[PDB]
Nucleic acid binder design. Structure first.
Lengths: 50, 37, 143
RNA sequence: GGGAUAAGUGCUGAAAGCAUCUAAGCAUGAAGCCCCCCUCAAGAUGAGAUUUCCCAACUUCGGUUAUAAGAUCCCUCAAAG
RNA sequence: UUGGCACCUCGAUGUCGGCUCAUCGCAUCCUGGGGCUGUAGUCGGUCCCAAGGGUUGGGCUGUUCGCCCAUUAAAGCGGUACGCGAGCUGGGUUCAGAACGUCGUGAGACAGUUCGGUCCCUAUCCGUCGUGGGCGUAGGAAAUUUGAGAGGAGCUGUCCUU
RNA sequence: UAACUUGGGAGUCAGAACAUGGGUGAUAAGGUCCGUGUUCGAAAGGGAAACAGCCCAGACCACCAGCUAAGGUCCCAAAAUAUAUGUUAAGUGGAAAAGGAUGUGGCGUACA
């Protein structure tokens, strides 16, 4: 129920190994020129050209 | 077959022998066979 | 302070070929153990490996004394409830003669990280043909 | 079904001129022992084997870049979750 | 099993009987293999070897026990803090109410009964059951495989013929 | 090599195991109560695999010097796979009794 022992820094930093953030899938837009999420609509221009 | 700590002849015909590290009495009458002496 | 110390820049390890044909199990494993540890060299160092390599041929022809071929049994547990197996020394010589001499010599070595490296310098075969002729092994007589 | 055994029954045979399953030598014999039947297994660091696929350009670092055969990002789904 | 001792725990190691899930010993209840009989046969007695698998459903009491009804090839005996409450029940036994018998001048007590009466915790570590990411296996890859070593399964009735 | 007297200041009044002479209990207890010695308590170091009380032995400090005690010399693990003469075949050695056996040694007193 309650922790018997406190957690040390060595043990705490190993559990947070996989606690990472993801890099989105972004590519340069054919017409806007800015970056864009694949399969989405360019916020800068508004063109998809599917 | 009688398995007893004390094995001794019950008649004069019975013979005492030792085979495979066991004291065995064998008699011509069937009831007098004994073992584990 | 003038005591000599051996390193991995001046150590020489050779290859031996011992024959187990007609030899006592316990009295042959105690001698091979000292060779694998380097207890026969004048430059012995405790914190480094200095032994040599040993090859055992004709393993299936080892010898026992008395009734140890039936009374001596080997146990092993599988870590499961009631999972304990067993096998007699006589039945193991006829199936896996190399595991019989391999485990008998491994028990005469220290159970450390260096002792596990010294136990891999051993090679056991049931016949007289070994594939390590390239290493140029030299015959050795037991003392 | 196979291979060795437990308690048993034995076959020859002396120690002990006879007897005796044993002390050397041959057998027979349990739902039990090891196989046979079903599933998982090379992190088995002792890391195994087989078939096929890819294999060039450089300051001549005893190196390096980008690719190749392949595998993903993302997207439409399930017999899977 | 009932006791003897008082060595660990009183700034705290929760009871009896169940329920759910099991494990392990052999001094073997059933099934398998054998002597000897005061063993005709069909059925038994006693003793040896054998732990692989099995070893019911109800009535009466809070119960263990124990008796009874109907079955079964058989309804074995013991250990694990009398297995098990961070898994669960609260019917008995140690709370505060009330009553009877008994004892006490009395407040009250049982060598006894009766009705009623709060069971709490979000899992840090080890352990256990599932499922992923790294690196290694001396070039980088896609498929098909050997099996060192582990796990699972092991029971038995009644008819017919000879 | 101590002992005794006078004065200043204390602590202690829960003890334990082993050997040995006894009571008690059951010629039970790591039980309990007395006599005597040792150790622990307040004692490290080596041995008994681990193990305050058992065996050897009492650490002022430093050294990559030597000889010994208990206990030891096949391997883990420092030292004899030493020498001489005998016993045991059971894994005895490395757990126990009353009883039962031409198992096998040593020293004495015509049998099929």
């Amino acid at each position: 129920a309650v922790p018997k022992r406190r957690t040390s820094k060595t043990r705490k930093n190993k559990r947070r190994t996989h606690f990472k953030i993801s890099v989105p899938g972004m590519t340069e837009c054919p017409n806007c020129g800015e970056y864009k999420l694949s399969h989405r609509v360019c916020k800068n221009c508004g063109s998809y050209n599917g | 077959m009688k398995v007893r700590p004390s094995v001794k002849p019950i008649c004069e015909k019975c013979k005492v022998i030792k085979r495979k590290g066991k004291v065995m009495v064998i008699c011509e009458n069937p009831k007098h066979k004994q073992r584990q002496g | 302070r003038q005591t000599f110390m051996a390193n991995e820049s001046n150590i020489e390890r050779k290859w031996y070929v011992i024959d187990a044909e007609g030899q006592t199990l316990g009295r042959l494993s105690s001698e091979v153990a000292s060779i694998l540890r380097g207890k026969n060299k004048v430059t012995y160092t405790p914190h480094v490996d200095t032994g040599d390599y040993v090859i055992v041929i004709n393993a299936s022809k080892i010898e026992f004394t008395g009734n140890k071929e039936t009374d001596k049994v080997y146990y092993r547990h599988s870590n499961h409830p009631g999972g304990i197996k067993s096998i007699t020394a006589g039945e193991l010589r006829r199936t896996n003669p190399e595991r019989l001499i391999e485990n008998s010599i491994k028990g005469m070595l220290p159970s450390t990280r260096l002792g596990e490296k010294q136990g891999k310098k051993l090679f056991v075969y049931g016949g007289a043909e070994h594939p390590h002729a390239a290493q140029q092994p030299e015959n050795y007589e037991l003392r």
